[PDB]
Design a protein around this ligand. Structure first.
Ligand SMILES: NC(=O)C1=CN([C@@H]2O[C@H](COP(=O)(O)OP(=O)(O)OC[C@H]3O[C@@H](n4cnc5c(N)ncnc54)[C@H](OP(=O)(O)O)[C@@H]3O)[C@@H](O)[C@H]2O)C=CC1
Ligand SMILES: O=C(O)c1cnn(-c2ccccc2)c1OCCCCc1c[nH]c2ccccc12
Length: 159
């Protein structure tokens, strides 16, 4: 099982400036719940976006994608290709825009949090992967985040 998990603005933006222009604790909690115990696969940019206190995400197998054969990520695996990271039974691809696109051929689950923020796409923004017609998905109800923003989860599924 290879799944993808991300939050996005309505416009499709998922990152900007190497970080994320929002923070919803309710999605962090949901993120932790869905990934806990399993493999988490990230690109080197996303690993760098992670504070050193938080790194590696506890209780999970942290794997970094990087083309530098000597890149050190203390507490995680650094692999040169994505097939290396798919040896565990449940693997979740946690970003960013590059690795989401790499993993999409392997994926049958997309947990998408949609953040009600009007975030027009600027150059250099990272983006959610386009989901074609092979993906079926249940659209959740709008919820209120204590950060002021509304959000809703999409759960996309394919065979
Ligand atoms: N809203 C959300 O839920 C999420 C948002 N984000 C944000 O989105 C952005 C993510 O960054 P993004 O620009 O997409 O970069 P990535 O996080 O996808 O990392 C790209 C890096 O991964 C390595 N890489 C890319 N392709 C390959 C490949 N085929 N093989 C081996 N290594 C590869 C490279 O490492 P190297 O260059 O060292 O060789 C590359 O620099 C950040 O802003 C982050 O804050 C991150 C995840 C979740
Ligand atoms: O999971 C944990 O236990 C944990 C512990 N600390 N942080 C954390 C908290 C604030 C800032 C950075 C990390 C955790 O998760 C991140 C949840 C934030 C939203 C998020 C959604 N997708 C992501 C992909 C990559 C990084 C962050 C996210």
């Amino acid at each position: 099982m290879v799944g993808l998990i991300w939050a996005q603005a309505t416009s499709g933006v998922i990152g900007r400036g190497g970080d994320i222009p929002w923070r919803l604790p309710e999605d962090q909690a949901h993120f932790r719940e869905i990934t806990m115990g399993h493999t988490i696969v990230m690109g080197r940019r996303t690993w760098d976006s992670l504070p050193a206190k938080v790194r590696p995400l506890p209780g999970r197998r942290n794997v970094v994608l990087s083309r530098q054969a000597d890149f050190m990520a203390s507490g995680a695996e650094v692999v040169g290709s994505l097939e290396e990271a798919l040896t565990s039974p449940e693997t979740w691809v946690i970003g960013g825009g590059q690795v989401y696109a790499l993993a999409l051929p392997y994926a049958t689950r997309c947990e998408v949090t949609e953040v009600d923020i009007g975030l027009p796409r600027e150059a250099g923004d990272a983006l959610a992967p386009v989901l074609d017609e092979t993906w079926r998905g249940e659209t959740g109800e709008w919820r209120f985040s204590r950060s002021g923003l509304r959000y809703r989860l999409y759960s996309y599924h394919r065979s």
